[PDB]
């Protein structure tokens, strides 16, 4: 069987960055030439692997993470970076072995009045560990008085919505990002090239 990269890259709607989706890739044959031979990607950066040699390699574990972020935050999807996305939404490891793929989605994820369905975690007390997902909706305590589910001063909802409109600049325009994680261990392979 062919690996289900179409169901990840060509999904009608992507997940929010705070609740980034992970699709496990196993027991299939992956033709990565469908990705690196395309001109529809604005970002295609592979760490520890060469994009042209992917079809000549076998992997024990492969994961595909997908989410939507702003154009100015694609840089944060990289090892050693800092920011709202890297610290509180999606953290890449320092020893990352994989590829980060992004493409502009203004014609799909931006609405005339503003698409407010895509969310990012704004308030958090600690930085995320690598490959960690936090989907909590608990009210964030900015002071010393507990919130107890009531929003107000020093008591804020942790998730804020992106304002995606077609008039937004490239930095504020939505970008769909797919992160591929490759694990090469001393174990039988599960994903191989044709």
């Amino acid at each position, epitope marked *: 069987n062919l690996c289900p990269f179409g169901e990840v890259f060509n999904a009608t709607r992507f997940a929010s960055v705070y609740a980034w989706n992970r699709k496990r890739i196993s027991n299939c044959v992956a033709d990565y030439s469908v990705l690196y031979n395309s001109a529809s990607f604005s970002t295609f950066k592979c760490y520890g692997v060469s994009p042209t040699k992917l079809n000549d390699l076998c992997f024990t574990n492969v994961y595909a993470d997908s989410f939507v972020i702003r154009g100015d935050e694609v840089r944060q999807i990289a090892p050693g970076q800092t920011g709202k996305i890297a610290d509180y939404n999606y953290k890449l490891p320092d020893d990352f072995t994989g590829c980060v793929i992004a493409w502009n989605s203004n014609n799909l994820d931006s609405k005339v009045g*503003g698409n407010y369905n895509y969310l990012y975690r704004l*308030f958090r*007390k600690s*930085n995320l560990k690598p490959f960690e997902r936090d989907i909590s909706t608990e009210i964030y305590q900015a*002071g010393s008085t507990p919130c107890n589910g009531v929003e107000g001063f020093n008591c804020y909802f942790p998730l804020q919505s992106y304002g995606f*409109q077609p008039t937004n600049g490239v930095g*504020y325009q939505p970008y769909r990002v797919v992160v591929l994680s490759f694990e090469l261990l001393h174990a039988p392979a599960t994903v191989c090239g044709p």
Partner: antibody
Amino acid sequence: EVQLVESGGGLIQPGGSLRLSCAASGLTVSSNYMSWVRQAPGKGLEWVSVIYSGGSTFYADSVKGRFTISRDNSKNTLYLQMNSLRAEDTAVYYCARDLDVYGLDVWGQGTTVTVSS
Amino acid sequence: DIVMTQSPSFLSASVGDRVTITCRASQGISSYLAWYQQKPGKAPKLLIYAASTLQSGVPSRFSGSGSGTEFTLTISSLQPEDFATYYCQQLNSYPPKFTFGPGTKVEIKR
């Protein structure tokens, strides 16, 4: 009540060093976005630096490497170490609590730093 | 970098006028915009966030409109304490975290 009290500013020669302190009450510095904003004489406002609740620090390009933002939870005070001071850095420095899309709601009275050009 | 501009620079008005100050963005920034008020010798005070929402404790005469490249701060009836310098602030920007506009000063008509 809620209040930010700033201190630590004066006159200093180019290449000098000074530390600003923004003591806070009514909010926890370690749990908030805390930003420094400066206003040059007769000019507008400009962002200087910000520290996240998670410890990440970001600086303006004109002050990266020279200015260092820090905090002490035991004293609930936000700090701004300013080294290698130049004539561009003379301004009234404001400490403020940042709420991102909700804006800068709490401000300090301000501290004047006049580098002795 | 996204450039924030404000028009006008000096505005003359009497008490009770409807005053509209415009802030312009070089690129679309949706609702990432905030309005502030500064008086001489006083630290800036937040008035509006998200370009339309009014901060608690701000009088209802202050209103904000616009999304994208053009934004306006509207005062329905100018009060004697409203004579100050007003700044717009782009939010969640890059490379700087936020960028302030040039500012607009409101003074007494005579």
